[PDB]
Amino acid sequence: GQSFEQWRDAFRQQALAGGIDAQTFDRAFAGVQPDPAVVEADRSQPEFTRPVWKYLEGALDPLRVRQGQARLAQHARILGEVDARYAVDADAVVAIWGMESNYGSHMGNKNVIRSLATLAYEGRRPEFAHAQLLAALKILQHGDVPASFMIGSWAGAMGQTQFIPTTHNQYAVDFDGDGKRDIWGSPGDALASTANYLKASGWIAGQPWGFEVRLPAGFDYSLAELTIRKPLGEWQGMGVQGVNGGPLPSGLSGEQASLLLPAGHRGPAFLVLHNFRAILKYNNSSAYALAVGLLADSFKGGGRIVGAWPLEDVPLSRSQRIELQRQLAARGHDPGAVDGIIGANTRKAIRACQQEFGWPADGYPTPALLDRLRT
């Protein structure tokens, strides 16, 4: 509709047609108007880094590590039961909990119905918003939480787990048996829900998400690519070693792994395994998944990175990523659609350009590359 009131009246019809009761709808929308803060967040396609090392610094903050250790102790019984029942490592569940809501202290302060209605009414992704809004109304109808306490982020990610509504409906768990899947106020429900989602996403209990490695001299950096997987044994037969030298972890010889270079060839290198892919299902960002894995490791005194981070790591802004794609295309290295998103097609073009300049082909774009392109 044109007015918010008009849009809501029309959506109310769709909500009823989808099985939401009038009382649930009217209770959910009581007092609701568009939220400009949500509109701003939706619109803000940013202009600034990063870099991964500052992001990891915040994520691996000793304050967050110690708070997770405290939570592991406080909730040891529940976590033991969740770890055993879902076959998902407690440290990973708690690391996700820390990264998503700071173990429940930062769930956001926005009402999920207001936020999703705002996005449905005037957001850039109304298909997503409408779908999530109807799912959210189903959650209210089922009674998992009262409308007043259905809290989450601007994009509709909810509660301690930051599940979007359709993910809650599919994977949230009632751990304590009161009949509510309360990912807002019940640590047990939240933790079991997170575990259930990780397990559905392929988690193998006890298997590392990945680990730091040392690459051999004259390494083929075009292989550092998440879309390329190889057995650990094959990586070993390529000259990839443990971070201090010597063979890679034993027994895993047949495990498929990809090479992750979060700061290009001058930075630390990681082999990442299937459990890393599981974390990406939670949040499809390699920086996020690396932070979750290192945080999980940190609870037990791990998470130490041996390779130095490059001092000159200054990630490209939105503007620069678009400029990079245009300059690559102009030089004859086709990155595909100029969308300002560095994915596989752009990395392919970056690698060809790096090879043209005689640089290691790590597919990792830097201000130096952009300068050289402008010559």
Ligand X SMILES: CC(=O)N[C@@H]1[C@@H](O)[C@H](O)[C@@H](CO)O[C@H]1O
Q: Distance from CA of residue 372 to its chain's centroid?
A: 32
- Where do we find the tokens 């094959």? 234
Binding residue for Ca ion, selected from 61, 81, 122, 174, defined by CB under 5 A: 174
Binding mask 224-263 for ligand X (x = CB under 6 A): ----------------------------------------
User: Which of ligand X, Ca ion, none is residue 180 near (CB under 5 to 8 Å by kind)?
Assistant: Ca ion
CB 246 within 8 A of CB 211: no
Instruction: Say whether 362 counts as a known binding-site residue.
Output: no
In the bound state with ligand X, the residue whose beta carbon lies nearer, of 282 and 359, is 282
Applying CB under 6 A, which of residues 55, 163, 209, 309 lies at the interface with ligand X? 163
Choose among ligand X, Ca ion, none what residue 162 binds, the Cβ cut-off being 5 to 8 Å by kind: ligand X
Give the per-residue contact string, 269-298, with ligand X (x = CB under 6 A; - = no).
-------------x----------------
- Could you say which of ligand X, Ca ion, none residue 174 binds, taking C-beta under 5 to 8 angstroms by partner kind? Ca ion
Instruction: Please say whether the dihedral angle defined by the alpha carbons of residues 352, 356, 359 and 364, taken in this order, is positive or negative.
Output: negative
The count of residues interacting with ligand X (CB under 6 A) is 6
Please identify which residue in 178, 220, 312, 339 interacts with Ca ion, judged by CB under 5 A.
Answer: 178
Q: Which residue is nearest to ligand X (CB)?
A: 167
Q: How far apart are CA 333 and CA 69, in angstroms?
A: 48
Is 282 known to sit in a ligand binding site? Answer: yes
- Rounded to the nearest whole angstrom, what is the least distance from the CB of residue 132 to ligand X in the complex? 9
The residues facing 163 across adjacent strands are: 158
Nearest to Ca ion of 162, 186 (CB atom): 186
Question: Which of Ca ion, ligand X, none sits in contact with 164, Cβ below 5 to 8 A by type?
Answer: ligand X
Query: Which 185-214 residues touch Ca ion, going by CB under 5 A?
Result: 189
By CB under 6 A, residue 164 contacts ligand X: yes
Binding test (CB under 6 A) with ligand X, winner from 24, 162, 325, 346: 162
288 is in an annotated binding site: no
> CB of residue 194 vs ligand X: minimum separation in angstroms?
8
Say which amino acid occupies 277.
R
- Positions in the binding site for ligand X (CB under 6 A): 157, 162-164, 167, 282
- Positions in the binding site for Ca ion (CB under 5 A): 174, 176, 178, 180, 182, 189
